[PDB]
Amino acid sequence: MLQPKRTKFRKMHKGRNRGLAQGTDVSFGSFGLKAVGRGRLTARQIEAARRAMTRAVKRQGKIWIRVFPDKPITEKPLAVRMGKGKGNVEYWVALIQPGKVLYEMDGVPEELAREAFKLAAAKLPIKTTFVTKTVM
């Protein structure tokens, strides 16, 4: 799930992770989960965190997923020898940099938001924090 429908090329290079994140601030909603840390979030992890928050807020308020898994992470099978091409495309991840806000939410109070975001934070591998909207 949460895989792009059309992709220009099937497999993509492994790459390295960027230094920091753009998209730090909360703009869609009042309350947010901002990652403090570097990592890869899988699509199953993103789905699990969103499911945790929506069960917590009980279909009240709106949840925004501000990240999307566009990175094809490819894995070779068991008992296969090295070489003989790249591996077949097994899952879709999103590279998370420090400072990236990943989830926004509105229409719930601050304590409900903080509980929902901590239940997401347990699911995600990266370390995260609660952030709130500010005026500039």
């Binding site: 099978p77 068991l78 008992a79 020898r81 097994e90």
Partner: protein
């Protein structure tokens, strides 16, 4: 492997459990549940008296037809109805462009889709290990092409005997895991029985309205659809009866038409609660035109799990849909030993089922009132706290008579070793 077949993929409709020599002619019976499996009925291929060839388990004309159907539809998987030998399956998948996945392979796939717990997933994993063990050697031949036959030194046994031993170690491990799950089920059984709590287990044909019977009884929502194995997991909700008192019902997963014996043994190793149930709630449906083969097969499955020998309150489903004969309440005997034909899946037969709960509990009509102790206020408070009676009446000289009675227990506490020096009863 963690990778699996893609859901929503096209498939042909040749594979309809056994078309012949098992069940009956039941094209439609497998067709409905495979629509529940998720492949749409674009084109159906049917074969009569299909020749059990040593080479393919089918004649070449039907092999050409099923190959043409799968390549014309563009379906990812070729499908075979009869459970066939792995080598004939290998010959057929060599002849076709796409590989053929077995009968029990797709039945395991739909079982894994319907399974939402690790206990059911462990049962499916055991049967999947059985099916994969049947087809491993033909699969491992292409791997041994890459191996080149190397590995002669070391394991001094025959070749693939070592990997057969590895599969056997998988069998040993999953036997240990299923024994652990059975230990958890035994702990749950010791939890649910208190030597005074009647328990009923809901069995029968799958998605035959037995879950809807539980829904009407307990007012707890069940999952009901055209799909088979919509209801899998048992849930236990307490309900109140006027005569029985307190009872609980657990919705055990039903049987497909002719469950395989491997699937029977798998769910029997998963749960023993059907055998350990004091009473059984069996719901038998007339969905097939030929009901008797269904009753015989499902009752033999119940005897395999030793639950038919437990008294079964038989629920005669589809009978209310036909309305050939109507449920009635009559006090014919104190046991009332009549086969209850009520179809309470719509809830039309629930008062007759309440009298059937009276028929399955100890239900003496005469109902001899117990002798009242001189201290009756504590007894009245206990009666009001446990179950306040719908009708309260008092006999002459202060005697209180009510429907719930415990005569043998009353005898044990009122006269075991007591001196009876006062001798109020003469």
């Amino acid at each position: 492997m963690f990778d699996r077949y893609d859901a929503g993929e096209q498939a042909v409709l040749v594979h309809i459990y056994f078309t012949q020599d098992k069940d009956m002619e039941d094209l439609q019976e497998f067709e409905s549940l495979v629509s529940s499996a998720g492949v749409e009925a674009l084109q159906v291929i049917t074969g009569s008296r299909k020749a059990p060839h040593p080479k393919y388990f089918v004649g070449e004309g039907k092999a050409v037809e099923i190959a043409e159907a799968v390549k014309a539809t563009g379906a990812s998987v070729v499908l075979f109805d009869h459970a066939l030998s792995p080598a004939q399956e290998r010959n057929l998948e060599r002849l076709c462009e796409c590989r053929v996945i077995d009968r029990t392979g797709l039945i395991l796939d739909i079982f894994a889709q319907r399974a939402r717990t690790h206990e059911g997933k462990l049962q499916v994993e055991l049967a999947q290990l059985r099916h994969l063990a049947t087809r491993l050697v033909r699969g491992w031949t292409h791997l041994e092409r890459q191996k080149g036959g190397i590995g002669l030194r070391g394991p001094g046994e025959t070749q693939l005997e070592t990997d057969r031993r590895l599969l056997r170690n998988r069998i040993v491990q999953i036997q240990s895991r299923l024994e652990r799950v059975e230990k958890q089920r035994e702990q749950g059984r010791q939890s649910r029985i208190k030597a005074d709590v009647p328990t009923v287990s809901l069995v029968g044909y799958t998605n035959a309205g037995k879950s809807t019977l539980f829904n009407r009884i307990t007012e707890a929502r069940v999952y009901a659809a055209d799909q088979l194995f919509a209801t899998l997991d048992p849930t236990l909700r307490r309900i109140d009866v006027a005569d029985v008192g307190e009872t609980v019902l657990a919705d055990t997963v039903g049987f497909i038409r002719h469950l395989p014996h491997d699937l029977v043994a798998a769910f029997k190793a998963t749960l023993q609660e059907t055998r350990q149930a004091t009473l059984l709630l069996h719901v038998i449906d007339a969905a097939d035109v030929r009901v008797q083969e269904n009753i015989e097969a499902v009752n033999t499955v119940l005897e395999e799990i030793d639950a038919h020998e437990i008294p079964t309150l038989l629920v005669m489903n589809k009978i209310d849909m036909l309305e050939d004969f109507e449920p009635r309440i009559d006090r014919d005997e104190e046991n009332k030993p009549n086969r209850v034909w009520l179809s309470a899946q719509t809830g039309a037969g629930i008062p007759q089922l309440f009298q059937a709960l009276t028929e399955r509990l100890s239900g003496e009509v005469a109902q001899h009132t117990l002798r009242l102790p001189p201290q009756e206020g504590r007894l009245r408070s206990r009666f009001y706290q446990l179950q306040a009676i719908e009708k309260e009446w008092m006999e002459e000289d202060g005697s209180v008579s009510l429907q719930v009675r415990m005569p043998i227990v009353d005898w044990r506490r009122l006269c075991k070793q007591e001196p009876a020096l006062i001798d109020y009863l003469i």
